[PDB]
RNA sequence: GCUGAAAGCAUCUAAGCACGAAACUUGCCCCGAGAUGAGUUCUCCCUGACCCUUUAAGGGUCCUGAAGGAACGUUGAAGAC
RNA sequence: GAUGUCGGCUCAUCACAUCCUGGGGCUGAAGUAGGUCCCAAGGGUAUGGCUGUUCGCCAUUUAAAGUGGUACGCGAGCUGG
RNA sequence: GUGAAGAGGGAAACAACCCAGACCGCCAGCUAAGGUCCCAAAGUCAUGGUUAAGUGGGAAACGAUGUGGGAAGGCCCAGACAGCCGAGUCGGCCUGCGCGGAAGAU
């Protein structure tokens, strides 16, 4: 099925009558406005593209004013894609809310996770130390070997060494929907989800 | 290279580079082999004369 | 050779088309069609069908013998039919039929449903015994295999699902 | 099964057959006399 | 006088159709290459490509002879340790039809910036259709 | 295992049909059109005069400078640069 | 007119003559638990006492604590018994 | 006998194996060993046979109704072989080409 784009706002906790806590991440969804269907016959498969939130006046460029002044919609902060099942049907302008998840139990949540730039391979790989006395010298941290002799006479590809270290795609599968509050466009999700607060986020009902 | 450019011209007139050379042979022709490429590229009603002439000897 | 130089007798009552190498026979039990390999030519006498090779192929007379057997059997199907009949051994071991499903308890946690597929006909006069009937030698044969697969006869007591006229042996320890 | 590189008759209900290029031996009366060259 | 050389700027080129329905895979592959290259016209030159334009239909229906439809292997290698990889004849005419045909012509022809450019003229489909009516190619009967 | 001749019987195979595993091809997650075979879809911008010559995907003067981009400044849960 | 040789640490990669998990045939296979052969390389596959030890014996665990090749893998990566 | 102290052509590459001994020039012709579907010069040549294993393009003792050829035996129209009647059927020998036996490290 199709599902939302959203706001990281932050963690809190509920409180049940039983006596248990529940960790949750909420998360702001507001209307998503559909602003143009791509069919077989034009472009080759069946999809959605959406908008949301609100962008000012001079920070819009001319081909984007016209993209949207086509749809008859009010300019938002982005586009996302959403690909159809068989039987499902849209149409240009039409708002979408929270409410589409009503009945839905589970959740995939996408993001960007956060950057701890250039990495080690203790941090970045789970590398063990060598000893830090009985006449170490200077290889504390160091990776050790990267290869063997003569024969094969190179470094492998794909081998583990140091380099960048996150701020990339990440998507968590299979979590609780907690509470879904359509007075106030809030989505409650049980557990951690990836990015920082402020980030964007997709949210689609779950696969397995 | 000469070789190459007379097979390509026989198997046009419906013949192979040995069997013609062969006919030539037998009917007593002594053009050689860089004289019939020139002429393979640059006079084609004589070098189908020239497989009449070999095609016969071969009859 | 010996089996192919035996004409098929078509008996009255049933139809025959030939085209190419495609056969069609019909009869009161139903239709049966088939296609015939490229090394046999079948004749159509008079009330006689008759099977011989053709000149090109190094195989001939055995292809020719397995397609007079063929149909045979579809001329004796469309007229009379074959049935089989099946037994269980055991102790709480049960069997009945609903529509064209027949369900079995074989000493599982878990019952049995099996499909039957379309042309056959299941019966059982007994809570420990299934008859089975139709015009296909082949799919008859084959539901039978699969019926007897699901527990087969063991080597101690001879429990399970069985042909009835099977011999089992048996051993001591 | 026994599977070994000389297969032969051990009574006179076995038999001889050839499946799928693998050369095979199957009786009627004794499981023991099943054999498979290789 | 010196011999005759052709030059790439004057040479002429045409453009035929090919039906490859039950035809030997082999056997069509050499045709295929000797025309491309130019090896049929007595202007061959081998530091010029003096060939012609192939258009080639219904590569899904090529043959093989004994048991190659299942006993054939195509291998390649990834380039990461470990990463061979295999396919049989069947399974690459079900997923990918026309490579089948593309890589026995490319084997057949000469290895070099030349090859590669003599690789360009060659136009393979699966089905019946194509869509190069403006060029107006002549039926070939291989 | 089913049906079945060569070999009047029997036979899982020669012609036909059915099952069968963490191995194979997919299904799950990430990169990806420098895929030189460089793909597709949506939107936005530019609508003046002359001269010479060896006459053609030719050279030059005047008028005009769009959509957009970069540079500079205040900076970030982005970062060795 | 020089290719630093045992053992430990760190980091690995391949074969299959398979230690565990997966699928089968025979049994002098009643059940539970075993013996033997065939197919299968996806993933997994101990911590301590003694000794410079690789091995080996002992103590207590585990579904299991596989056998070999890679300059008896790896000192312009560390140690120096 | 060749290399050493010897070039050119063939055997993928390959001093010592096979063909053959380079005084200089030529955009002439004939052949050796080895070859003629494409990379790559020349027969998708002609006539009669064998193989179905990609054998050809790695290996033994031993095992088996794969299948081509040759010379002799036993039974059979006075009824043979197989199964439950009406033309063939049994077991050795010599020889051509194939099949299993056949597991390794970028």
Redesign the pocket.
Known sequence: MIGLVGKKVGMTRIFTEDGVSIPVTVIEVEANRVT?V?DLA???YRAIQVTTGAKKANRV???????F??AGVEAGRGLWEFRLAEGEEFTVGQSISVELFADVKKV?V?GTS?????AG?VKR???????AT??????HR?????????????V?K???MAG????????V?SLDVVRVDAERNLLLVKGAVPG???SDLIVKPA?? | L???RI?AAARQNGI????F?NGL?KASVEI???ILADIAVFDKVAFTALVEKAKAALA | ????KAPVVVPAGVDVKINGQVITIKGKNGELTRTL?DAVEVKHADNTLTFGPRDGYA?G??????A???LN?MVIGVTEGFTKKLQLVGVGYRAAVKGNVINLSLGFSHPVDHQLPAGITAECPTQTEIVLKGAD??????V???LRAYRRP???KGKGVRYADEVVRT?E? | ???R?????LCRNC?????????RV?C?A???H?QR?? | ???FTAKPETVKRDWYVVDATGKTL??LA??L??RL?G?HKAEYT?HVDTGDYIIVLNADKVAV????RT?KVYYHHTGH??GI?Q?TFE?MIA?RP??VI?IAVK?????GPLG?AMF?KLK?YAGNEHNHAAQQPQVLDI
């Open positions: 143009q791509k034009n472009d080759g460029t001319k081909p984007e004013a016209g993209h002044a086509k995939d996408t956060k950057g701890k730039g250039f391979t790989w789970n590398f063990r130390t060598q000893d009985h006449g170490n010298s200077l290889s160091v990776p050790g070997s990267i290869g063997q002799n003569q024969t094969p006479g190179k492998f794909g081998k583990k960048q270290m996150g701020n990339e795609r990440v998507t599968q920082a607060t402020g696969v397995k | 000469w070789i190459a097979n192979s580079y040995s069997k050379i042979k050689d082999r860089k | 050779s010996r089996v192919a390999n195989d007379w055995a292809q020719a013998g397995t007079r057997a063929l059997s030698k082949q799919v008859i044969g084959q039978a295999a699969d063991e080597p101690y051993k320890a | 099964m026994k599977v590189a000389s297969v032969k008759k038999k001889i057959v050839k499946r799928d290029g693998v050369i199957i009627s004794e499981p023991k099943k060259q290789g | 006088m010196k011999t082999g056997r050499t045709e290459a000797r290259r090896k081998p002879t004994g048991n190659k006993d340790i470990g990889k396919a399974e997923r026309e490579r593309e084997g057949m022809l000469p290895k590669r360009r393979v």
